[PDB]
Structure formats: structure tokens, C-alpha cells
Design an enzyme around this catalytic site. Sequence first.
Site, PDB file in Angstrom:
ATOM      1  N   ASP A 162       0.893  -1.171  -0.035  1.00  0.00           N
ATOM      2  CA  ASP A 162       0.090   0.110   0.194  1.00  0.00           C
ATOM      3  C   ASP A 162       0.711   1.404   0.092  1.00  0.00           C
ATOM      4  O   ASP A 162       0.239   2.510  -0.324  1.00  0.00           O
ATOM      5  CB  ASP A 162      -0.879   0.023   1.176  1.00  0.00           C
ATOM      6  CG  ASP A 162      -2.155  -1.034   1.112  1.00  0.00           C
ATOM      7  OD1 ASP A 162      -2.910  -0.775   0.117  1.00  0.00           O
ATOM      8  OD2 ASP A 162      -2.226  -1.846   1.607  1.00  0.00           O
ATOM      9  N   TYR A 194     -10.446  -0.925   1.807  1.00  0.00           N
ATOM     10  CA  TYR A 194     -10.494  -0.936   3.206  1.00  0.00           C
ATOM     11  C   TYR A 194      -9.909   0.336   3.929  1.00  0.00           C
ATOM     12  O   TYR A 194      -9.153   1.200   3.397  1.00  0.00           O
ATOM     13  CB  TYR A 194      -9.605  -2.136   3.877  1.00  0.00           C
TER      14      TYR A 194
END
Lengths: 715, 723
Positions: free
Chosen positions: A338, A423
Site C-alpha cells: 500500500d 479498506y
Amino acid sequence: SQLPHCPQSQLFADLSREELTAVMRFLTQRLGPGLVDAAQARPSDNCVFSVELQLPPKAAALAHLDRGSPPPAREALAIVFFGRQPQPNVSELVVGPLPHPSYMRDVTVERHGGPLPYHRRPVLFQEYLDIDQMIFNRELPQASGLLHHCCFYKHRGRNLVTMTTAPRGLQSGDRATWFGLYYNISGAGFFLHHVGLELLVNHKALDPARWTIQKVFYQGRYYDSLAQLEAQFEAGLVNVVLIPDNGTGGSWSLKSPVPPGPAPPLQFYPQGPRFSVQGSRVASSLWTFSFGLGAFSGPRIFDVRFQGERLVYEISLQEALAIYGGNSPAAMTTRYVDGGFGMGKYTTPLTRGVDCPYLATYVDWHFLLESQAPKTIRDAFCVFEQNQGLPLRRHHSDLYSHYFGGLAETVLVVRSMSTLLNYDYVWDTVFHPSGAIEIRFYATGYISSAFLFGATGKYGNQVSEHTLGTVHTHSAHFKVDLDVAGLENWVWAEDMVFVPMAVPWSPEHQLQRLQVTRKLLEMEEQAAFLVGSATPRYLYLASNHSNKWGHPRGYRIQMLSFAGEPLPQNSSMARGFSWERYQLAVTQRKEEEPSSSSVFNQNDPWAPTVDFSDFINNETIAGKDLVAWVTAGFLHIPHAEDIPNTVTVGNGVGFFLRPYNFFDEDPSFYSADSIYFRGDQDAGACEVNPLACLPQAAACAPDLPAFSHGGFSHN
Amino acid sequence: CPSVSPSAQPWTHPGQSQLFADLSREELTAVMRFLTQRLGPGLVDAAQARPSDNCVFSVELQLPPKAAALAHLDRGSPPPAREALAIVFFGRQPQPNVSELVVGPLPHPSYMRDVTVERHGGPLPYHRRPVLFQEYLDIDQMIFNRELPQASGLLHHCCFYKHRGRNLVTMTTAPRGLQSGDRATWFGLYYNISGAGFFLHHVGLELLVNHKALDPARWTIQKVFYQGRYYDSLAQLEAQFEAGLVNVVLIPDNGTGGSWSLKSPVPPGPAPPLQFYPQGPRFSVQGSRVASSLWTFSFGLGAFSGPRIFDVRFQGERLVYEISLQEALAIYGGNSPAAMTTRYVDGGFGMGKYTTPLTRGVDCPYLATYVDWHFLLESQAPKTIRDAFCVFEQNQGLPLRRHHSDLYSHYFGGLAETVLVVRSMSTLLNYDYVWDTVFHPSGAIEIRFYATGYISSAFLFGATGKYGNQVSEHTLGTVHTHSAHFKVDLDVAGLENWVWAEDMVFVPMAVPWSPEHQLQRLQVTRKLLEMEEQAAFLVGSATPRYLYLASNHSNKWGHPRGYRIQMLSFAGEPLPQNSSMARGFSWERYQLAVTQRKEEEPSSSSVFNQNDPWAPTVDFSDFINNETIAGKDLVAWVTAGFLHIPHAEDIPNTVTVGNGVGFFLRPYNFFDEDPSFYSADSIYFRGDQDAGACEVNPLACLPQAAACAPDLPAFSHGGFSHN
Ligand SMILES: *[C@@H]1O[C@H](CO)[C@@H](O[C@@H]2O[C@H](CO)[C@@H](O[C@H]3O[C@H](CO[C@H]4O[C@H](CO)[C@@H](O)[C@H](O)[C@@H]4O)[C@@H](O)[C@H](O[C@H]4O[C@H](CO)[C@@H](O)[C@H](O)[C@@H]4O)[C@@H]3O)[C@H](O)[C@H]2NC(C)=O)[C@H](O)[C@H]1NC(C)=O
Ligand SMILES: *[C@@H]1O[C@H](CO)[C@@H](O[C@@H]2O[C@H](CO)[C@@H](O[C@H]3O[C@H](CO[C@H]4O[C@H](CO[C@H]5O[C@H](CO)[C@@H](O)[C@H](O)[C@@H]5O)[C@@H](O)[C@H](O)[C@@H]4O)[C@@H](O)[C@H](O)[C@@H]3O)[C@H](O)[C@H]2NC(C)=O)[C@H](O)[C@H]1NC(C)=O
Ligand SMILES: *[C@@H]1O[C@H](CO[C@@H]2O[C@@H](C)[C@@H](O)[C@@H](O)[C@@H]2O)[C@@H](O[C@@H]2O[C@H](CO)[C@@H](O[C@H]3O[C@H](CO[C@H]4O[C@H](CO)[C@@H](O)[C@H](O)[C@@H]4O)[C@@H](O)[C@H](O)[C@@H]3O)[C@H](O)[C@H]2NC(C)=O)[C@H](O)[C@H]1NC(C)=O
Ligand SMILES: *[C@@H]1O[C@H](CO[C@@H]2O[C@@H](C)[C@@H](O)[C@@H](O)[C@@H]2O)[C@@H](O[C@@H]2O[C@H](CO)[C@@H](O[C@H]3O[C@H](CO[C@H]4O[C@H](CO)[C@@H](O)[C@H](O)[C@@H]4O)[C@@H](O)[C@H](O)[C@@H]3O)[C@H](O)[C@H]2NC(C)=O)[C@H](O)[C@H]1NC(C)=O
Ligand SMILES: *[C@@H]1O[C@H](CO)[C@@H](O[C@@H]2O[C@H](CO)[C@@H](O[C@H]3O[C@H](CO[C@H]4O[C@H](CO)[C@@H](O)[C@H](O)[C@@H]4O)[C@@H](O)[C@H](O)[C@@H]3O)[C@H](O)[C@H]2NC(C)=O)[C@H](O)[C@H]1NC(C)=O
Ligand SMILES: *[C@@H]1O[C@H](CO)[C@@H](O)[C@H](O[C@@H]2O[C@H](CO)[C@@H](O)[C@H](O)[C@H]2NC(C)=O)[C@H]1NC(C)=O
Ligand SMILES: *[C@@H]1O[C@H](CO)[C@@H](O[C@@H]2O[C@H](CO)[C@@H](O)[C@H](O)[C@H]2NC(C)=O)[C@H](O)[C@H]1NC(C)=O
Ligand SMILES: *[C@@H]1O[C@H](CO[C@@H]2O[C@@H](C)[C@@H](O)[C@@H](O)[C@@H]2O)[C@@H](O)[C@H](O)[C@H]1NC(C)=O
Ligand SMILES: *[C@@H]1O[C@H](CO)[C@@H](O)[C@H](O)[C@H]1NC(C)=O
Ligand SMILES: *[C@@H]1O[C@H](CO)[C@@H](O)[C@H](O)[C@H]1NC(C)=O
Ligand SMILES: [Ca+2]
Ligand SMILES: [Ca+2]
Ligand SMILES: [Ca+2]
Ligand SMILES: [Ca+2]
Ligand SMILES: [Cu+2]
Ligand SMILES: [Cu+2]
């Protein structure tokens, strides 16, 4: 009666609107026109991708903070894509004395030992848009017969949306990206509405015209192209399963059908707040620190001082990792690094009352990423005091002497939240009145789903109609640069053992003698604990000096982690996040080793820009500036209770930093809020017990401000 | 603003009975009257009793059989007989025993049954009896009148021995001997500090008192330990002292700091944060029932086993019949005989019996609901621990769930987590156990205990930290382990349950669309645990990261409806099996175990294991044998604990930070979706909507509704006693 209303340097602060502007001006000038706004840029353009703070060297920063020396040059780092060039070398550029910038230095070759290949560049926002142009104009209509039958395809393509995948290929240099197709749900997560179609887009070519589709996956079978499918569809041998596009329930909504009841509990500070936020410093009775966000690395905290004394120079989030498995190509090959997207870049506003307590102090974040003018995330941070409803310490004595002595635990929190596609990560840093620090991260928000087909749970559970909840692991890495009572530190491991013995006063009998085992971890390799290994229950970094009772002054790392099984070493991909393989590691702190990951690992993990395992290199850790690298994570098998979002309950994972013979006694003995009274004293006497005066002091209505939300535009 | 409840608490359906409530003041008295009558005079008040007396030691609720309790709670059948259990010491006898006596239909008792032979297969030996309060006093008479004066020459030099009056105090130890039958107890001696912990002021003298004899006159001192050396008697020491070859180290009589005080030298500053309920509370406590929007349960305390909860129903459906604390364990090491042999089986004292009052604003939030506990232990009249329980809602300042969407559609949807807590606190000598049960709006239940209070210390002498750290002047903080055991009787969507273990694995594969390459295919492994032995996980073993108990039926998506056990435990190394003592707490050796639930297997420990662990009354390991756990009434046994090496930051007390240990119970395909989607408190709004419009967002109306000074009552404290 008419009851009334209730009431040091900025050296690590993130760059301000002006500072960002000043560097961009300086860059547009001295980097030669021909420069494109990153929002508009194409592969063959020249581009400023990011401008953010360049952290100072430690020695200079310490000389200023302690010795009183002048500050080190405040600098900025700019990531520049150099596309309009036959051989692109994407470049790292340091810029200027930053109040009024004056110079520039390319550190790419310095830091990474050579040019950074262009294919490692993160996928631009414009690049994503170009990809959707190809999919929706050039590609999807070739299967509009199928799409009309399955998926409510409107001649103007936007009832479908695409979501990116992860390592773009199979091999260093590749830039081929699977893309799932989902219904464009209004006001709720589309992630739960995979239509069953994934497209492998090859977008390595500098000319988007040359981009092609290599493979097609539809409802359980592979195809060569959208035509090759569409043929077999109209030939009558591709059997569709209708995926509905609209319905009612958690699969389709976040709005509750149940009206609000009586209000939930609320905290307030009856005598004003007990902390201050001045820019990037927070200051309280006990604690002092600077905070911020790296654009890609995420939340970080500097110069933390308990009652005036530095415990830690730096605690920063370093990387986050999500490795998936599934029955479809997207899920079974997704490995999100990420940081290649950006934990700071994707910080979302904190909803006052949901994300933090209503009366928290909310703070904005300024950034310059993929654009030419700096922007702001409103309410990016929140800082607040939380009454834990729990005692910090307690004793109630009915034996030999009647007394009570305790203290309710009130903590200081700093929180950021990153929304990376489906998320939402929550980033907690909790400061305890005992002198302990706590790092807890949470994973909430929507799960990633796939279309469900002939599979026996090898890859997850069915959560809704036609929807597979794809198995995956979360894991994050943290840099913990403790300076325990100075720079020079040692690593200690203490633990337990039983030893059989004859009873001294009855040698005919056998006891089991509990003892403490203690070992000094001398070499870096002795402090590298792989995931799955047995771990000392007491491991701490300690100073050379001692407290009053002769023990080395240390703090101790205590991990709350359910870490998943790591990606095997056999995989060429693993080197891009080799920190996953460890639970905890202590290495020599070095300026040329500032981070365990890189934004450039996401797109080329096979030839990693940063490989963490290289830091563990067979040196002494006995009496150096040490730095602890902590990995925390868990395995997630999605289930039915995970269809409005993932709840945070029990999924918090992280570590404690606790004093271990650092003080001469628990500092909460000196607490201004500690309660104590004898049995012969009057517990209701306000004189004796401050709690008795609480009804008088807390007899006021709060002045809780009007609800604002930090908004979100369309970036 | 409000002062009591708001809109009439809850409206759900029926099925609220107090079949699990602890015995009331009346119920205890009725049994004691019944006992004094039908058990024959010659009966002594337990507070006054001597070893050879006849004695009622305890009277508390006898839990009903499950089948009859369920038939009442569900099928509508009549309640089973409400009964009580009485522990009676039978000393005035040629062969003295302890006996377990069930008594009466308990509104108006009418019978009595000795179940000792029924339950334990034979008489209970008398030496297993817990040490009475009078027995402790008699020992102190012996020590202070008969014994300590024999060394007053030494004592005057080291320890400020004043005439005959006590400035010194004794503290008990643990397994009283080395062998089944023994009753020899080491006693440390400490300065009797006023208003703070004496445990930090060991004078360096320990005495091994043999008090097995039924006649206190015949009690003797087997050994004497002083400042690093053993002696045969206090005379034998006192000889070598006056002979000039016993070198004293002065332990000071007084001081300042955390070593000596709990009162802070720092005056109060601005008040800390405070919670309140702006529109009244959202839960009710009617006797032993608690009822809220989501949760319903009956709570209580066992006198020896401790806190417990029954008939837990999330939104009207039972999840668990019983979650009860079973035993607590502290195993020590040290350089002195007291520390190095201490193994407290605290159930032998009583987690309920030593429940302390909860100080309003410190132990729980100020505005919690405090509840009293009635008991009858070591006396003839029942007493009361005021504010023994507290029940409250806590805003976690944390979202339960959240999503912030910047992609393709602009919306926010979340919910701040507010939990429901039930808490008791047990003060067992030096330390304070906190017992948390936290009920979450997701359908999850949480069990966390904490250890705080004073550490146990010893006098420091020639030792290299093998047994702990030096915490203060002349004080060794003795190394030890904490560990507790929990009975968790889940009934997931019915009685019949199975045990599942799911976990992960990687599989090499050729890439389907490029077989020249290799991937690592992440997959899920799943195994059904069939035999009890497959569900007994020893400490140190590898554990499935997903382990859950599930029903035969399925949710909407065809998966077995289960809950899942998730453990937060740093469990310490267990006492080896080679020790004869270990059988008295064999549950320590496991992290988790699932067994067939059986009426004759109600508890993993016994109050009688403390004084005779070599011949244990209850031996937990016997529960685990070759029986099926595939489709039975199951019961999970969870062990949680940690190792504690005392350090300097542990000298005002032990802080709770990070020392919280326990386990979660989380829904795993139990529902068709997370029930918090239906939450009355969930926030949602689109980007084109007005977030400040109260219509749209209830949070916008919070300033209007929370414009209110609380009505926080006047501070009360539950007092103390001389026991
Ligand atoms: C997936 O499906 C969704 C519907 O099912 C689509 O959602 C729609 O997206 C569009 C595009 O973002 C939204 O735009 C329309 O409404 C906005 C709202 O304007 C108001 O709020 C803005 C804050 O963002 C303010 O800046 C405005 O001043 C105003 O107060 C309009 O801004 C839009 O622009 C219109 O006007 C401009 C300028 O004149 C023109 O250039 C445009 O052509 C347009 O005429 C639109 O009116 C829309 O609100 C939203 N629909 C719903 C129901 O939420 C979504 O687009 C689709 N997929 C993708 C990929 O977008
Ligand atoms: C990775 O790629 C980057 C760019 O993609 C490389 O950076 C380039 O480095 C080149 C040398 O390696 C360098 O090329 C030549 O030019 C510079 C001079 O240009 C700089 O200085 C001028 C000032 O000089 C006068 O002339 C200019 C017109 O050119 C006038 O405007 C000005 O007023 C003045 O009178 C700057 O204006 C200009 O913008 C440049 O900063 C020489 O110094 C070099 O020695 C070399 O001969 C090129 O300029 C760089 N590109 C930039 C700065 O944009 C980088 O080297 C490469 N690295 C690797 C390892 O491949
Ligand atoms: C604790 O650690 C600190 C930090 O040093 C680090 O830790 C030690 C243990 C080593 O691992 C180092 O490699 C690490 O960097 C120690 O700090 C140092 O302490 C010294 C003693 O207090 C101090 O010097 C003193 O002595 C000087 C005289 O030099 C002597 O040595 C030479 C041979 O090298 C010998 O010929 C001569 O005769 C002397 O005996 C004197 O000049 C100084 O004024 C001072 O009095 C060091 O300055 C100091 N380090 C620094 C960088 O200032 C500390 O000793 C450790 N304490 C322990 C081990 O108890
Ligand atoms: C889920 O489990 C429950 C609980 O039972 C347990 O789990 C099952 C799977 C078995 O392993 C049991 O050994 C476990 O105890 C199951 O509950 C049972 O459900 C039955 C079906 O409804 C019910 O009996 C019904 O049928 C009776 C007739 O008997 C038949 O079988 C004999 C051969 O043995 C055959 O000769 C005869 O002709 C019949 O075909 C009938 O008399 C009953 O009235 C009733 O209608 C059982 O009573 C019940 N168990 C108990 C203890 O009452 C459930 O079926 C499972 N559900 C699934 C698998 O979906
Ligand atoms: C260890 O030392 C402890 C103190 O150093 C001893 O504690 C003392 O124990 C006695 C007996 O239990 C206890 O009772 C005494 O004091 C009572 C309260 O004082 C009266 O006067 C004050 C004003 O000064 C007034 O405010 C009170 O309301 C009260 O009327 C008396 O009522 C009682 O009769 C008796 O004299 C002491 O309170 C207690 N002292 C302290 C300081 O806690 C303890 O006994 C000793 N251990 C052993 C085993 O002996
Ligand atoms: C990882 O690399 C190791 C290198 O030692 C290799 O042994 C593993 O490959 C194979 O794993 C099989 C089990 O899954 C085993 O049957 C086989 O013998 C083994 N190969 C060899 C040469 O022994 C690799 N494992 C993975 C998961 O990639
Ligand atoms: C998704 O479906 C619901 C119904 O399931 C839609 O509600 C309909 O709304 C339209 C106009 O708003 C009405 O004409 C219909 O009568 C409604 N149907 C029902 C069954 O109530 C909803 O509008 C749909 N979603 C979207 C974005 O249009
Ligand atoms: C403890 O002592 C405090 C101060 O007295 C000190 O100790 C004695 C032994 C001498 O050394 C003297 O010079 C010191 O000042 C008192 O304030 C305190 O009341 C004492 N605590 C008691 C009596 O419980
Ligand atoms: C227990 O005794 C056995 C004797 O066979 C020995 O091998 C083992 O090591 C002992 N365990 C401990 C913990 O001492
Ligand atoms: C049955 O129990 C014995 C121990 O008595 C054990 O050795 C055996 O493995 C068990 N078998 C099964 C099937 O559980
Ligand atoms: Ca290194
Ligand atoms: Ca360091
Ligand atoms: Ca059994
Ligand atoms: Ca059961
Ligand atoms: Cu997840
Ligand atoms: Cu402890």
C-alpha cells in the site's frame, strides 16, 4: 441558580501550503518548461509526482534539540517522472533551504545506486483514466451482446466500474494489470458486486494507443479477448449467471433501517482540556511530541518526551501489506504494497463523533501529490484524551490497615485513517500515564469480493448472493527508533525456566525452582526473530546507565500480533516486502537506512528498490544507536458478519513500549489525579478525596461545537 | 436533565427469570436457621471456631442442572428446585471430615443431602480444609506470644520490637507442606506499615509453622529462615546472634515515596475526562438480570470460583449458557523459602469471598451502576460487600466500523463503538484482580482480567537476579506467573455443537496464463476436530488461528453458524509434570480445551486443591479422555496468563497497561450479516447530502441534545472491615 457552560521546535512538522508552493515554483523554474500537471500527465510527459518533507539527519536534529546548535537545513523531496526522454530515469530530488529555496540535488544514484527504472513508477490518476477509456470505449462494446444479457449494459458505459489489482505482472519490468469489473453502486461499496469479469490490461507502452488486453476472465473461464468470449456467448455455449444490480440490505447499503434511539455516552473535559496542539507539537502534563504524515509511509511521531525526557526519536509507519488468495486471477495474484499508493496520500477526513470522540481536537493535513497546487485533507488527525473507564492501578486493603489507593486510566491518543480502495486502516498511537506507548492499527471498511463459482471454500466463505469473500492477510511494519536514556543502547532478552532441586529443609522431596534466564543479544542476527519462532517473553532495549537499584534503564517491546504465515521465500516477489518474514528486528540505525520499504516496490517487487532483509547484516548491536522494526498482522477469512463492513472488534493488532527499570518507581505515584484515603478518613470529604468534589465541578453543560465534516471532492 | 431511567428501559418479549441470582439475605438466613436446627447443637460460629469444632464454613447458591434450567427458560416448564450448597467442617469427631451439603427448596427450605461421597467418591480429608480466620489468629498468638519473644534480643537490634505490642505482621504462604496431609505453612514477617502496602517491607524472617494438629497447643515451628540462613528454632538463632556471628542488615522502619505511600505529593489539577448519558441510560439492572437494546444476561459471584454470567442472549437469542471464572493461579520463585515454594490456588481462598468495593470514578466510571453482593462465609449472619459489581456503557472513542468513499461515489458510513461492561474486583492479599466482561455491539463477547495492586516482595540478599529485580532498598521483587481458567459453555444455535479449526497454507503453482512462471497460491485449510484429545491444545503448541464452535445448521449462505475463540494470552511456562503438585492445577498446562459438558464435571478446580494439591479434589486433566466432541453439548476451557518479572515501575502498584489478558468470542457465519448494520446509532450520509442537517445526520443534533449539566450523585464509598 442558572447552571453555566464548561470551558519546543517545529523541525519535524509537515510542509505547509507556502512551503509546498515555494518548492513547486522553484521546480517549475529550474527544471525547464515542458512540465505537465501530474493530474494531466501521460506516460511520455515530464511530471512532478510528489513534494513532501525531507526528514533531517539525526545528529544535526539532536544537536539543535539538545545541545542548542542551529537547525539543520529544512529540505523537501520531490519525485519526478522523466517521460519525455528516450531512456527515462525517474528521479529523487532534494530542494532548497526551504523557507526560501535555493538549490536542488538528484539523490537517486546516491540512494539506490543507479537510476530508477521508469516501469516502477506508480500508476498515475490520469493513467487510470486512460485505462478506463480503453476498457469502456475500445474494448467492452466488443462484448455488448454478453453485457446486455448479464449486466444491464447501457450504451454509455458507466453502469460499470473497474478496480486496480496489485504487482503489475509476473516479472521485473512488467506493467500488466488485472482489472475487475463491478456494478457502480450509488452510496455504498461496489466491492461486493463483482460482475464476474476481469481484464488483464498491458499498459507498459509509453503510447496508450499501443496498450492491449492480454487475457479475459469471465465467470470461471479464461478467454483470449472480448471477441473470443462474445463469439462463444452468441454461439450459445457461455452460460451466464445473472448478477443482480440492486437490492436491499447490508450487501447493498450502509444506511440503517432503524431510527436513532437515546444518545450514546459522551465524554467531555469538565475543567477544560488538559493538552495543547500548536502546529505539529502536542504538549500535555506528561507528554511532548511532534506528529505528521509521510505521503507514502503514513503516520509518524518524533521527539517523544515523557516528563521532559526523550524516550524515542522516531516512531513511523513504514509499510502495509495485503496478500490475497482466491478462485479468480485478481484475488489469487493480488499483493498490495500500500505504500506504493500512499498511506498519507489516502488519508480520509475523520468523521467527528464516529472516528474519534466528538470533543476531540481535529487537525488538517496539507499535501502536494499528483497536482501543481497543494491541497488539504480536513480533519486528517484527531488528538484527544480518553477516560478508559478502567483503573491504571488500584489497591483495596482490608488487612492490617484500612486504606484505598488508585488512579483511573486516562490516555492521550493520536489517530489517522487511510482509505486504500476497499479498506480503511486506523492508525492509533496511545500514550499511557505509566510512561508506556501503544501502537495499534485497525482494519475496517469493505472487504474485497469476487464472483462465486465452483469452489469448496479453498479460497474463502460465501458472504452474500453470488459473492466470495476472498481470503487475505493484513500485516504492517513499524520503525521504532528508541533512544533509551541516550543513543547507545543494548538489546536484552529475559525469560523463565524451571530447575529441579532437593528441598533445602527436606531433601527427601523434589521441588521445581522457578528462575529467570537472561541473555545479551550481541549481534544483529540474534535480534532478528522470524515469524513462527519462539520469542523471549521479555525483550527490551536498555541504556548503559542504571536506575537507583542498579538495573540498566530500559524499555521493553511487547507484541499483540496474530501474524499470518508469510509469503514463501521461493517467490521472486517476496524480496519486495521481506519484512513480513520477521516479527521483530533490531538493527544499527543508519542514515542510509531510513525506511524498510519504498513506494517503488509495489510495481516492481521482483527487483525491489528497498529490500528490508539487507539491513540485518551481521553487525554488533551492543552499544549503538539502535532501531527496532516491528511487524504486526493477522489472517482474515471473511464471513457473514463482515458485509456492512469489517468491525474493529478484536482485530486491533500492534505492540506496547513499556518501562522496565527505566524509572526508580512508577511515575503515576506522582499523579495529580491519584486517589487515596484511609478507612478512618472521610471519603466523601472533598478535602480528602477529589472525587467528592467532582459533582460540584462537573455541574455544567458542555459547549460542544456545531457538527462539521471535512468533505472529500472527487480525488 | 434526567436523574433515573428514561423511556422505560427495554421492551422485548418475556423469558426473564432470576434462576441464576446469588442467594439473597433472606435465603442465606433461612438456610443457616435450617442448618443450626437440623445439624444438631454443638455448632460454633466459624469466626470463632477451632480445628476441633463443628463449623458451617460457607453457604452459597447451588447451580441448577442445565436440562431443567433450559426447560424452564425455553419450553416453559416449572423452575428446578432452587438449592444451596453448604460446606461444613466436622471437627468434633473421632474421624473429622469436611462435607458438602445441599439444602432445601430454597424459598422455604425443607431437606438436606450430603453429596460429598456422591461428587468426590469418598470423604473429604480434614487437612484439606481452608485455613480459617480464627486459625490465622491462633497462629499469630503462637508467633507473637510463645515464639517471637525468644529472639527479642535480635528483634530489638534489627526491627524496632516494641515491648510486646505488634508492629510486625505475618502473611500466609501457599501449598501448606510438601506432601498430601501436611499443614506446615511458611509465614513472612513484615513491618506493619500504616496506610500503605506492607508487602514491600519484608524484614528478612520467615517461620515454618506446623499447624496440622487439632490442638493449637501442639503446633510447632519446624524451621526458621533469617536474612539468608536457615535455623532450627528462634533460640538457635538468638544464640548465634548474641554470640556475635549473625550479622544484621537494618531494614528501615519508615520512609517516603512509592515504597512507603500511595498518597501523591502532587495536588489535583484540572478534572480528567468524564462520560455521561445525555438522554438517560440505555440499559437496566433488575436484581441479577441486565437488559439492554442488544444484550440480556444474569450475573453473579461464586464465593470461591468468582465472577460468572448466565443466559446471555444477543437480540433475544442465546449464545452462551455459562461463562464463569474457574480458578486463578500464581506460581512464584525466589531466594527465600516463602517465595520459592509459593503456589497460590486462589480459589482455595475465594475470588468472590475477597471481592472488594468498587471506588466510584477509579475502578469504574463515576456514572456506572454499582451493585451490592450478599454472602454468608465464615460467620453465622450474612454480610454485604457494597458496590461489589459495576455495570456501565463505555464509549470506546473508536469506530466499530467505518468507510469513507472518495471513489466513484461519495459517501461515509460508520458507527462509534459503545460497549457494555460488567466488572468485579478481587483483592487476594497483595494483588488486585480485575474481572472484565465486555459486550460488543457486533455480537462479540470479551473476557479480560487484570492484575494490579502490590507485588509480593522479599528481603534482598546475595543473588544475581535469578529470582527477580531489586525494586527498592533491600527489596527483591519476586518473579512469578499469573494464570486463570475460564469455563465457557457456548450453545451456538442450540446444544449440539462441533469444533472447527481453519488456518492457512501456500501452494506452488504454474501461472494459469503463463505456466513458465511460479506463484504461491494462498488457500484455506479446514479440519473438523472429532475427539476431545484433538481439541486439547497444550501451552506452547501451535494453535489454529481460526478455531470455532459451530451448529449443525447454516446461515443464509450455507455455512455452519459458529462462534470463534480468539485468545490474547502471553501464557507463562507451566509447572512441570514431574512435580507431584501439578495435578492440583493441571488446567495450567493447556491454552484451550473443549470437552463434553457434563453435570458431574461442573468445575475445573476446587477450593480444596489449595491445601492438598498432591491429592487433588478436582483434577482438570481427567475431563479430557476418548470422547466425541462431534455433535454434543460442548464446553470450552480457556487458559490465559503471563509471566511477571517485577521492576521499578511496579512500586506504587502494578499498572494494568498491557497486562490485560483473556480471550474473545466472535461471530463466524453465525448471522447472515453483521447486526450493527441495523444499529440505531449508525451514521451514514452521501456527499451531495447535508452532513450538518440534523435530519440527515443525528450527530448534528448532538449539541442540541447534549446541552445539559449532568446530575452525578454524591460520592459514596463501600467501606471496609477487619477481616
Ligand atoms: C456511478 O453512478 C453514479 C450514479 O448512479 C454517478 O454519480 C453521479 O456522479 C456525478 C459526477 O460526479 C455527480 O455529478 C452531478 O452532481 C454534481 C453535484 O453538484 C453539486 O455538488 C458539488 C460538490 O461536488 C458542487 O461542486 C456543485 O457546485 C453542486 O453544488 C454536479 O457538480 C455535476 O456537474 C454538473 O455540472 C457541471 C458544471 O456545470 C457539468 O460539467 C456536468 O456535466 C454536470 O452537468 C452533476 O450534476 C452526481 O451527483 C452523481 N449522482 C448521484 C445520484 O450521486 C457516477 O458518476 C457514476 N460513475 C462515475 C465514474 O462517476
Ligand atoms: C536523470 O535524468 C535527469 C533529467 O531527466 C538528468 O538531469 C539532467 O542532467 C544532465 C547531465 O547529466 C543535464 O544536462 C546538461 O546540462 C546542464 C545544464 O543545464 C542545467 O543548467 C542550466 C543553467 O545553464 C544555462 O543554460 C540554460 C539553458 O540550458 C539557461 O536556461 C540558464 O539561464 C543558464 O544560462 C539550467 O537552466 C537547466 O535547467 C539545467 O538545470 C549541465 O550542467 C550538465 O553538466 C549537462 O551538460 C541536464 O540539464 C539535467 N536536466 C535537468 C536539470 O532538468 C540526470 O542527470 C539523469 N541522471 C542519470 C544518472 O542519468
Ligand atoms: C556507558 O557507556 C558510555 C557510552 O559509551 C558507549 O558505551 C561504552 C560501554 C562502550 O561500549 C563505548 O564503545 C560506547 O560508545 C560510556 O561513556 C564513556 O565513559 C568514559 C568513562 O566515564 C568517558 O571517558 C572518561 O575517561 C577518559 C580517559 O580515557 C580513558 O581511556 C584511555 C584508553 O582509551 C586510557 O588510556 C586513559 O588512561 C583513560 O583511562 C577521559 O578523557 C574523560 O574525561 C572521562 O573521564 C567517555 O568520555 C564516555 N564516552 C563519551 C563518548 O564521552 C560509559 O563509560 C559507560 N559506562 C559504564 C560501562 O559503566
Ligand atoms: C443437525 O443435528 C441435529 C442434532 O442431532 C445431532 O446431529 C445429527 C446430524 C446426528 O449426528 C445426531 O446423531 C446428533 O445427535 C439433528 O436433529 C435430529 O433430526 C432428526 C430429523 O429431523 C430427528 O428425527 C426425526 O426422524 C425420526 C425418524 O427416524 C428416522 O431414522 C431411522 C433410522 O435411524 C429410520 O428407521 C426411520 O424410519 C426414520 O427415517 C422421527 O421419529 C422424529 O420424530 C423426527 O421427525 C431427530 O429427533 C433429531 N435429533 C434429536 C436428538 O432429536 C438434525 O437432523 C441435523 N440437521 C441437519 C443435518 O440438517
Ligand atoms: C498495624 O498498624 C495500624 C496502624 O499503624 C493499626 O491500625 C489501627 O487498628 C485499630 C484497631 O483495628 C484501629 O482502630 C482504632 O482507631 C479507631 C479510629 O480512631 C478514632 O479517632 C479518630 C480521631 O483520631 C476518629 O476520626 C475516628 O472516627 C475514630 O473514632 C478507634 O475508633 C478504635 O477504637 C481504635 O482505637 C485504628 O483505626 C487503626 N489505625 C490506623 C492508623 O489505621 C493496626 O491495628 C496494626 N495491625 C495490627 C495487627 O495490630
Ligand atoms: C521452497 O523452497 C524449498 C527449498 O529447500 C523447497 O524444498 C520447497 O519445495 C518443495 O516443497 C514440497 C512440499 O510442498 C516438497 O514435497 C518438495 O520436496 C520440495 N522441494 C524439494 C527440492 O525438496 C519450496 N516450497 C514452496 C512452498 O515453494
Ligand atoms: C434500487 O431498487 C429499489 C427498490 O428495490 C428502488 O426503489 C424504487 O425507487 C423508484 C424511484 O425512487 C420507485 O419508482 C420504485 O417504486 C422503487 N421500488 C421499490 C420496490 O420500492 C431504488 O430506487 C433502486 N435504486 C436506484 C439507485 O434507483
Ligand atoms: C516517617 O518519618 C518522617 C520523617 O522522619 C524521618 O525519619 C526519622 C527516622 C529521622 O531520620 C528523622 O530525622 C526524619 O525526618 C515523618 O514525617 C513521618 O511522620 C514518619 N512516618 C510515620 C511516623 O508513620
Ligand atoms: C521430567 O523427568 C524426565 C525424566 O525422564 C526428564 O527427561 C524431563 O526432562 C523432566 N522435565 C523437567 C521439566 O525437568
Ligand atoms: C484412547 O485412549 C488411549 C489412552 O487410554 C489412547 O492411547 C488412544 O489413542 C485413544 N484412542 C482414540 C481413538 O481416541
Ligand atoms: Ca544494519
Ligand atoms: Ca536508538
Ligand atoms: Ca469429558
Ligand atoms: Ca454447550
Ligand atoms: Cu481484512
Ligand atoms: Cu504480578
